[PDB]
Amino acid sequence: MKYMITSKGDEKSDLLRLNMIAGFGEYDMEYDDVEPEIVISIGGDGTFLSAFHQYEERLDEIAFIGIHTGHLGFYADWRPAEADKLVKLLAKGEYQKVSYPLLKTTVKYKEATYLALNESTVKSSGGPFVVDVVINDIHFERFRGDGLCMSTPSGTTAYNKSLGGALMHPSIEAMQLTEMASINNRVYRTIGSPLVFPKHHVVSLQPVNDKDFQISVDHLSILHRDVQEIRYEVSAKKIHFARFRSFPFWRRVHDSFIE
Amino acid sequence: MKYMITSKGDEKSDLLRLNMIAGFGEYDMEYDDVEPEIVISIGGDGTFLSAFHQYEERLDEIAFIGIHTGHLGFYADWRPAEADKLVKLLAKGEYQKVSYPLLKTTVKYKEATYLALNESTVKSSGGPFVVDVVINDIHFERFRGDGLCMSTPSGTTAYNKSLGGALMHPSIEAMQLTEMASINNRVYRTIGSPLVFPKHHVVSLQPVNDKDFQISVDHLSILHRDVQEIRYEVSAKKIHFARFRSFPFWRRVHDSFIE
Amino acid sequence: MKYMITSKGDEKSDLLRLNMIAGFGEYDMEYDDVEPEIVISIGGDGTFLSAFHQYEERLDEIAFIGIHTGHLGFYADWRPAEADKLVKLLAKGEYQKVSYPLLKTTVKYKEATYLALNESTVKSSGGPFVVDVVINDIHFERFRGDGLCMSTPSGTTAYNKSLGGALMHPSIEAMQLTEMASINNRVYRTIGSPLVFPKHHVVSLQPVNDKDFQISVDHLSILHRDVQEIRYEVSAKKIHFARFRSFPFWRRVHDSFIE
Amino acid sequence: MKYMITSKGDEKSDLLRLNMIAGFGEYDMEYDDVEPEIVISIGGDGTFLSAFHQYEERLDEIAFIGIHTGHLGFYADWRPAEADKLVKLLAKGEYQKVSYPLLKTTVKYKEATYLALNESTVKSSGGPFVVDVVINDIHFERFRGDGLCMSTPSGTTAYNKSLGGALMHPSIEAMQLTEMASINNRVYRTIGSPLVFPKHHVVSLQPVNDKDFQISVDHLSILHRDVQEIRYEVSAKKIHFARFRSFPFWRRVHDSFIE
Ligand SMILES: CN(CC#Cc1nc2c(N)ncnc2n1[C@@H]1O[C@H](CNC(=O)Nc2cccc3ccccc23)[C@@H](O)[C@H]1O)C[C@H]1O[C@@H](n2cnc3c(N)ncnc32)[C@H](O)[C@@H]1O
Ligand SMILES: CN(CC#Cc1nc2c(N)ncnc2n1[C@@H]1O[C@H](CNC(=O)Nc2cccc3ccccc23)[C@@H](O)[C@H]1O)C[C@H]1O[C@@H](n2cnc3c(N)ncnc32)[C@H](O)[C@@H]1O
Ligand SMILES: CN(CC#Cc1nc2c(N)ncnc2n1[C@@H]1O[C@H](CNC(=O)Nc2cccc3ccccc23)[C@@H](O)[C@H]1O)C[C@H]1O[C@@H](n2cnc3c(N)ncnc32)[C@H](O)[C@@H]1O
Ligand SMILES: CN(CC#Cc1nc2c(N)ncnc2n1[C@@H]1O[C@H](CNC(=O)Nc2cccc3ccccc23)[C@@H](O)[C@H]1O)C[C@H]1O[C@@H](n2cnc3c(N)ncnc32)[C@H](O)[C@@H]1O
């Protein structure tokens, strides 16, 4: 079936990509980077993120696979030495698909929407970051600090984790909001705790004075001007992985952070 | 319909309970503290917890209602001044039921199971608390510290919150584990972050050396001797509330912690 | 004696500054914004910071005084209603001076040094912030995250506090380093805890790859290019306050954050 | 000169203690566990703590030395393989003494005072721990939670660290207070941040309702009944170490927690 392969760009990843392609030639696997059904990432989680965003408009017709050439990633959970064994089962099929929820970010001024696999982040364009946080049209708090991070389930082991957020299993269709260095005194008051919102809940950020913010989605971070609203909600779209062996999320957590 | 009313025990709560009963007498509402269908708590969240545990074996046939005589609680979300208006709608009906997930705690040595509305906590009986944490039969970490807290969704605004845990909407069928003062060095390593587990996941705690632990479920805290295993999982049972007005969880959070 | 007065710039602060000046005219108090011995700030802590930096090269010959027109600040610990009583004791004298330690920041490429009253902060110019942290010529850790904050004693109630740092009494000649969102896994390892360094200890930050950093000292934040080293140490210079009533630091903390 | 040696009690530590004694016999080093001038601990930090408390009434006439048979400790900073080289320099002398500050804890009901090398901890005897915290006779906050930890400088790498406290160099004559799981809402308010107090500052804990508390000093934890006041202050006494090689505190931190 149709497939494509992204590479980190170094000698190790490029040479492994050419060997897999030659392995796929020994089957009737057509290379097609326009309409692939199978997307293989080789490198690290950053390389996987690029591959996800490169085909984020055909997520429903693609199964992703990660191969880590550096250290183990959460999305690149295949060592290079298992590449030949990976090629065989890919060519036949008989693999189940697992789906992780995604995060939708709407930015009104027209309006622009983004899909994130890890998280969507807002900071100030210089000076204080002040937003009113609104949950399902309910004013929840006025946040003054460095920024905010809305994380997918599978993103919680990333930036969200460094911000004190909880780690949550990717089968939970939810999103998690964490704070960056909120000021808290008699005047300003934030909840402090991370917040975990379910599907169909809309978290909206509304500016107070400064309307310019630096918003980032996974890799890309672009400065938005004259922002009226930032909306977060669990996406209706989901990223599909091709799984062959059992690699539970919590084992992946153990290997990455404990031993 | 059958109903009963629990009181905090002070003058304010006892006198409000007698006035509601007299109000219920003006309807055909039979008082029955053996098989009630409606359980009204008057006082604070602690008073509500007692009422929940008093009838924790008939949760499927009961709708709970909380009235806070002190400050606002998360389960006692009715002011005393709304008691008369509460009596009327209760007697008629035409109220929807909302259900919050619960936490099941199994303690093997026979074996004893408990149901918690807030959280289940383990500490050492004196000296160091050391347990191996196992997730779905996968050894995750060896924890050395003061203890661990497994919190329901609606419990996350309680002890879980003071332990740095995330706050999560009660519609999410999950449980959250937080640490108390874990040591972390070159020898000992814990994840640190709070963990959010979905339904049908079993978190098991297994002793290393000391087998005596102080385990607490909501109010009660009993010392267990010669413990072989502590199992946590999302309960199949759910607590049902009787809701009349709209009081969203996040509004309840706002009122309790922000303003 | 010679004196000058800085104003926040709004109607309330400007009108109070003109009334104090007229009050000082009723004494032989010469206004001199070039070589003042007494610097009065009117507004908030930000207004005080500006006044400190405006005369940071004559700190040894100046006593500062703060008047908060908005809410209470840590440096502007005088209400406007006490301005007349402040003018009298200032004109006579008979006031003791209290001194708070300061932070010195050296940036080598020549080299530039800065004096901070609150804290000195480093972040990346875009992308990952990676520095090697060196303590008294001892490689301590390789930091990967959003940035670092070195805080004076009296700065610990500011940014340092929002970053989880400890609050410390200003009589302690020390500086405190806190982290912003450090990544921690099997590869990267930071201490996590805030660090409190004594006088004559030199904390040096050394770049790994990217040499561009956004460094901020109190108000000002300037982008530095081709940075070779950032040195932190307790300054030999100290800021002198003019104190009239007893306002202990811990009372100032209580009023600002508790009640 | 007079000396004694404490052992952890296992085969490795006991056999090393007998070899050092035989090594000391080859000099005119008199063994005297009643009035020793040199106290050698063999085992871990716990073994060192016991040795400190065993002679806590002759601290001014003793230099302590630690040898870690397990992993490296902060006080047992000598490997067993360096025992012979340690014996030689001990017998001659020509070693400088370094002194770490200590913590004094007064418990009034008569009154009992304690000296700690790591920290002094208070918890409730069952149920809620509620104390009013008073700083230099100034009511600072009403604490409701699990407990409080007052840590020496050299204790900050211990329990204090697990409680989010700052790590501070032992040359700083100070003490640090950290919280355990303080509740914080609209009713209850604590500072949250760790607090670092200088010498001659008195932190006093005063009960609200329950007068029974479990107080611990380093190893020992005893239940106190009918407590009227708990006083913390930097002790006037100091523990003296015998140092031979340069082992800076921050290197000791690096080895223990980073690499
Ligand atoms: C513009 N101020 C002036 C100051 C000061 C200040 N001194 C102290 C102090 N010794 N002790 C206790 N409180 C203090 N104040 C309190 O500062 C409040 C106003 N300042 C403020 O809103 N600043 C910011 C808040 C949030 C985001 C910001 C982003 C960019 C720049 C500033 C931000 C007053 O009301 C005073 O009461 C500069 C100070 O801003 C501190 N700062 C920067 N980032 C954060 C942050 N993320 N969280 C908390 N603080 C932050 C930084 O340390 C500067 O020194
Ligand atoms: C029995 N030890 C002796 C000691 C010491 C000690 N000094 C220091 C220090 N200056 N700097 C750096 N590291 C230190 N060590 C490290 O202590 C490790 C062993 N000790 C330990 O396992 N203790 C505990 C861990 C977890 C739960 C405990 C429950 C009850 C009692 C002790 C518990 C050695 O390997 C050394 O390297 C007493 C010390 O235990 C500290 N402690 C108590 N509770 C916790 C906690 N929840 N988290 C972290 N520490 C805690 C407390 O401060 C005592 O001073
Ligand atoms: C360039 N990466 C790609 C990714 C990813 C990623 N996904 C996950 C995940 N699902 N679960 C677990 N681990 C993950 N990884 C781990 O990311 C490591 C490399 N990435 C990294 O070094 N990033 C950064 C670290 C420190 C400062 C940064 C500043 C700007 C931009 C990125 C920064 C790999 O080794 C993977 O194992 C983008 C991700 O960077 C995350 N990020 C941004 N800021 C921080 C921060 N302050 N602290 C921690 N993470 C941060 C953000 O969430 C992006 O998704
Ligand atoms: C006796 N209460 C009944 C309850 C509850 C409760 N439910 C919730 C909830 N779903 N969501 C939000 N808030 C809640 N409340 C708030 O509880 C406050 C009163 N309770 C309280 O003061 N408890 C304690 C505070 C501090 C130390 C304690 C030590 C031993 C026992 C209890 C302690 C009310 O005002 C409600 O508004 C039992 C609950 O105490 C929680 N708890 C235990 N230890 C801590 C701690 N260290 N920090 C924070 N909470 C702690 C634990 O989870 C029990 O479920």
- Does the annotation list B219 as a binding residue? yes
Give the list of residues 6+ apart from residue C167 with CB closer than 8 angstroms, or none.
C156, C157, C160, C161, C253, D191, D193, D194, D195, D196
In this structure, the number of other CB atoms found within 10 A of the CB of residue A115 comes to 20
Rounded CA-CA distance A10/D156 in Å is 44
Q: Give me the helices (H) in chain C, please.
A: 11-25, 45-54, 83-92, 159-162, 249-253
Which residue in C164, C166, C258 is closest to D195 by CB distance? C166
Give the CATH number of domain C102-236; options: 3.40.630.40, 2.60.200.30, 1.10.260.40, 3.40.50.620. Answer: 2.60.200.30
Q: Indicate whether residue B159 lines ligand 4 (CB < 6 A).
A: yes
For residues A105 and D114, give the distance between their C-alpha atoms in angstroms, rounded to a whole number.
58
Angle, CA B112 vertex, CA B107 and CA B115 arms, to 5°: 90
The rounded distance, in Å, linking the Cα atoms of B76 and A105 is 35
Distance between Cα B49 and ligand 4 center (Å): 10
DSSP β-bridge partners for residue B7 = B42
Distance in angstroms (rounded) separating the CA atoms of residues B224 and B213: 6
Q: How many CB atoms lie within 10 A of CB D50?
A: 16
Breaks (C-N over 2.5 A) in chain C follow: 109
Gap between the Cα atoms of B16 and B47, Å rounded: 14
Distance CA(D157)–CA(C235), nearest Å, equals 26
CB A56 within 8 A of CB A62: no
Say if residues A257 and B191 touch (Cβ distance below 8 Å): yes
**Which among C194, C196, C251 has CB closest to D172?**
C196
What distance, in Å, lies between the first and last C-alpha atoms of chain C? 38
Q: Residue D185 corresponds to which amino acid?
A: N
**Residue-level length of chain D:** 259
Inter-chain CB pairs, A–B, below 8 Å: 99
Closest CA to A175 of A113, A99, A232, A96: A232
Which residues fall within 8 angstroms of residue D40, CB to CB, at 6 or more apart? Answer: D3, D4, D5, D6, D20, D64, D65, D67, D90
Which is it for strands C195-198 and D167-168: parallel, antiparallel or unpaired?
A: parallel
C-alpha angle with apex C143: C178 to C104, nearest 5 degrees? 50
Give the DSSP letter string of A150-183: EE-TGGGGTHHHHTTPPEE-TTS-EEEEEEES--
In chain B, breaks (C-N over 2.5 A) are found after: 109
Q: How many CB atoms lie within 10 A of CB B226?
A: 8
Extended strands (E) in D167-210: 167-168, 174-180, 195-198, 203-207
Q: Quick check: C190 and C141 in contact, CB under 8 A?
A: yes
Contact D44, D80 (CB under 8 A): no
* Helix D83-92 × helix D11-25 angle, to 10°: 40
Q: In testing the pocket of ligand 3, which one of A6, A45, A178 has its CB within 8 Å of the most ligand atoms? A: A45
Residue C82 CA to residue C88 CA, distance in Å, equals 10
Q: How far is CA B171 from CA A197, B249, C112, in A?
A: 9, 10, 56
Exposed, middle or buried by CB within 10 Å (0-12, 13-18, 19+), for D168?
buried
Structure tokens at D73: 């400790």
Count the Cβ atoms, other than its own, within 10 Å of residue C161: 24
Determine contact: B148 vs chain D, CB below 8 A.
Answer: no
Query: CA D4, CA C64: separation in Å to the nearest integer?
Result: 56
Token pair in block for residue A183: 């000021």
Task: Give dist(CA C74, CA C253) in Å, integer.
Answer: 8
**Which of C138, C194, C253 is nearest residue D251 as measured by Cβ atoms?**
C138
Q: How close is the Cα of A143 to the center of ligand 1, in Å?
A: 14
Domains B1-101+237-259 and B102-236 share a fold: no
Buried b (16+ CB within 10 A) or exposed e, A14-36: eebbeebbebbeeeebeeeeeeb
Which residue, among C55, C34, C45, has the nearest Cα to C8 in the 3D structure? Answer: C45
A45 a catalytic residue = yes
- Across the strands, what pairs with C241? C64, C98
Tell whether the torsion through CA atoms of A244, B174, A176 and A173 is positive or negative: positive
Report the DSSP beta bridge partners of residue C240: C99
Mark A81-95 as b/e (b = at least 16 C-beta within 10 Å).
eebeebbeebbeeee
- Regarding the beta carbon of A145 and ligand 1, being less than 6 Å apart is answered yes
Final resolution, Å:
2.4
Instruction: Tell me which residues have their CB closer than 6 angstroms to ligand 3.
Output: A 44-46, 49, 73-74, 118-119, 154-155, 157-159, 162, 218-219; C 127-129, 144-146, 181, 183
Catalytic residue among A14, A28, A45, A210: A45
User: Is residue B252 less than 8 Å (CB to CB) from chain A?
Assistant: no
Could you tell me the CA-to-CA distances from A46 to A42, A241, C42, C57, C181 in Å, in that order? 10, 16, 50, 48, 18
Q: Where are the domains of chain C?
A: 1-101+237-259, 102-236
Nearest-angstrom CA–CA distance, A9 and D187? 57
Q: What is the DSSP annotation of chain B?
A: --EEEEE-SSHHHHHHHHHHHHHHHTTT--B-SSS-SEEEEEE-HHHHHHHHHHTTTSGGG-EEEEEESSS--SS----GGGHHHHHHHHHH---EEEEEEEEEEEEE--EEEEEESSEEEEEESSS-EEEEEEETTEEEEEEEESEEEEE-TGGGGTHHHHTTPPEE-TTS-EEEEEEES---SSS-----S-EEEETT--EEEEESS---EEEEETTEEEEE-S--EEEEEEEEEEEEEEE-S---HHHHHIIIII-
CA distance D245 to B211: 43
Under 8 Å between Cβ of A176 and A146: no
- B163 in D contact zone (CB under 8 Å): yes
**Inter-chain touch B166–A196, beta carbons under 8 Å:** yes
Active site residues of C: 45
Q: From CA B191, how far away is CA A156, in angstroms rounded? A: 13
Location of structure tokens 């740095």: B164
What distance in Å separates residue A222's CA from the closest CA in chain C?
A: 11
Q: State the ligand closest to the CA atom of B164.
A: 4
Could you say which architecture CATH assigns to the domain A1-101+237-259? 3-Layer(aba) Sandwich (3.40)
User: Is A162 labelled as part of a ligand binding site?
Assistant: yes
At B255, list the tokens.
Answer: 């009122």
Closest residue in C to A219 (Cα–Cα): C127
Return phi, psi of residue D63, to 5°.
-115, 125
Sequential DSSP letters for C32-63: -SSS-SEEEEEE-HHHHHHHHHHTTTSGGG-E
Experimental technique of record: X-ray
For residue D8, give the amino acid letter.
Answer: K
The first and second tokens of residue D78, run together, are 């000598």
β-pair partners for C33: none
Q: Give how far Cα D57 sits from Cα of B160, D36, D247, Å.
A: 43, 12, 27
Cα C200 to Cα C235: distance, rounded to the nearest angstrom: 9
Name the D residues in 185-204 with CB < 8 Å from any B CB: 185-187
Which atom number of ligand 4 is nearest to the Cα of residue D124?
Answer: 29
